[PDB]
């Protein structure tokens, strides 16, 4: 009698969706709020860190911004233990394609290989599926800039602007009315900054606790250049926007 569902995750839940995935969604809401925006001139990525006060040095250490390549970039919102495994794994798969084919790996193929890892845990064995959500920002020579979202269920969908954490549906509403096809790099910086302030309980969002990164097409020869903005440069962003 019974003696099931307590070990292997292959047994389906009474609702048809595994309760382990539902509990992973709650861990995503406990993390920060990362809002990506896909545009023709680049992709803007910004998030608010969990650590606080004055004790932790927030200038050097960034857990929500990781660079896979000079084009593809990821935004980590979720559990760090499950995220670190795919960080080195994606770097291996991206360099193997660059080793074998000598080309930049597309986001659709790269995420598909990473999506099967989260799916393989719910497929074979009772291993824990990754409940961390990745925001994939990359550029290709065919479809241009591609922006997807990694769900703990193991799938991914295309998104122009996606938000995680608290107020997920509320952030997508503010970005819809402010969405523009002619939006430049600077136009996406201010609207993403004002939306993040309203969707979070902390309106302060200093320079150290907030991480800001933007891929720009206006570099030399139109090449993709990823510039990591230090908190010293983030402080100047609040002066231009007039919030702080």
């Amino acid at each position: 009698g019974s003696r099931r569902y307590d070990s292997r995750t292959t047994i389906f839940s009474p609702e048809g969706r595994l309760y382990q995935v539902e509990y992973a969604l709650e861990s995503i809401s406990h993390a920060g709020t990362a809002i990506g925006i896909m545009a023709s001139d680049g992709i803007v990525l910004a998030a608010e860190r969990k650590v606080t006060s004055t004790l932790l040095e927030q200038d050097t250490s960034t857990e929500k911004l990781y660079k896979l390549n000079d084009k593809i970039a990821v935004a980590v919102a979720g559990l760090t233990a499950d995220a670190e495994i795919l960080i080195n794994t994606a770097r291996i798969h991206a360099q193997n394609y660059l080793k074998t084919y000598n080309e930049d790996i597309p986001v659709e193929i790269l995420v598909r290989r990473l999506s099967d890892i989260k799916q393989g845990y719910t497929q074979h064995g009772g291993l824990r599926p990754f409940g961390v959500s990745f925001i994939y920002a990359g550029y290709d020579d065919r479809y241009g800039y591609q922006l997807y979202t990694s769900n703990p269920s193991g799938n991914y969908t295309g998104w122009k602007a996606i938000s995680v954490g608290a107020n997920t549906s509320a952030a997508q509403t503010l970005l819809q009315m402010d969405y523009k096809d002619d939006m430049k790099v600077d136009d996406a910086i201010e609207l993403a900054l004002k939306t993040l302030s309203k969707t979070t309980d902390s309106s302060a969002l200093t320079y150290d606790r907030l991480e800001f990164a933007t891929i720009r097409k206006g570099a030399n020869d139109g090449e993709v250049y990823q510039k990591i903005f230090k908190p010293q440069e983030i402080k100047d962003i609040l002066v231009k926007t007039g919030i702080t």
Partner: protein, 240 residues
């Protein structure tokens, strides 16, 4: 399991794994298709109600396994990142080892065999996504349409509706659609698909995905301007 046993049967002869696997299809998107004389029409429902979705970068739910053999599913897109890739590898393997174009009946057994293998294997679950396999007879114009279920079985269907409100749409396929005299042209096959979608869809530009597969390796997606063309003809009948 520590002291636990993983063998599951239940007195009804139907395991709880497949019972709750079909619920994911019913709670997911709805899929429908109609096999005509000269062509096969496969409809698909996507949700565009969410804010700022890009269709071009989003992988299409209708995947092309072979030139004359395509595939469309209904359910979670997570389980489709694997089973679809398996049929694509077997498609190139069938054209290699046997020097034969992909057989619609043979490929259906492989797609249904993946879930069939996981039902009998312990510590693993079958894919809870039902796929609709549509292909053509090699060196022939005769269309073929098959259905794949999470139970690991396949059955041949000329018209089928899966997903949310499946039995509701099947009532339209038993009246407007006739198997004894199926629609000969392409437009009449699409009109029955459009009439079947708008019940659970209600128009929309990106919410309707219809891929008409034609012989001689001819595949073209339905244009957005032609979507409202069939909807206009439907509204003309409501005025009478």
């Amino acid at each position: 399991g520590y002291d636990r046993a993983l063998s599951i049967f239940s007195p009804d002869g139907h395991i709880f794994q497949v019972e709750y696997a079909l619920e994911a299809v019913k709670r997911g998107t709805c899929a429908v298709g109609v096999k005509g004389k000269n062509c096969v029409v496969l409809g698909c429902e996507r949700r565009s109600t969410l804010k700022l979705q890009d269709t071009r970068i989003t992988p299409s739910k209708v995947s092309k396994i072979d030139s004359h053999v395509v595939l469309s599913f209904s359910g979670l897109n997570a389980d489709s990142r694997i089973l679809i890739e398996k049929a694509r590898v077997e498609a190139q393997s069938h054209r290699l080892t046997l020097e034969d174009p992909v057989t619609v009946e043979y490929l259906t057994r492989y797609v249904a065999g993946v879930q069939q293998r996981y039902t009998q294997s312990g510590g693993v679950r079958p894919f809870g996504v039902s796929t609709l396999i549509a292909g053509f007879d090699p060196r022939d114009d005769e269309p073929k349409l098959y259905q794949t279920e999470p139970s690991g079985i396949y059955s041949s269907w000329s018209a089928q509706t899966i997903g949310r409100n499946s039995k509701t749409v099947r009532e339209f396929l038993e009246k407007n659609y006739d198997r004894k005299e199926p629609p000969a042209t392409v437009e009449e096959c699409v009109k029955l698909t459009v009439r079947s979608l708008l019940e659970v869809v209600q128009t929309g530009a990106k919410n309707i995905e219809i891929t008409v597969v034609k012989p001689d390796s001819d595949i073209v997606a339905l244009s957005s301007e032609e979507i409202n063309q069939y909807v206009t003809q439907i509204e003309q009948e409501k005025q009478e």
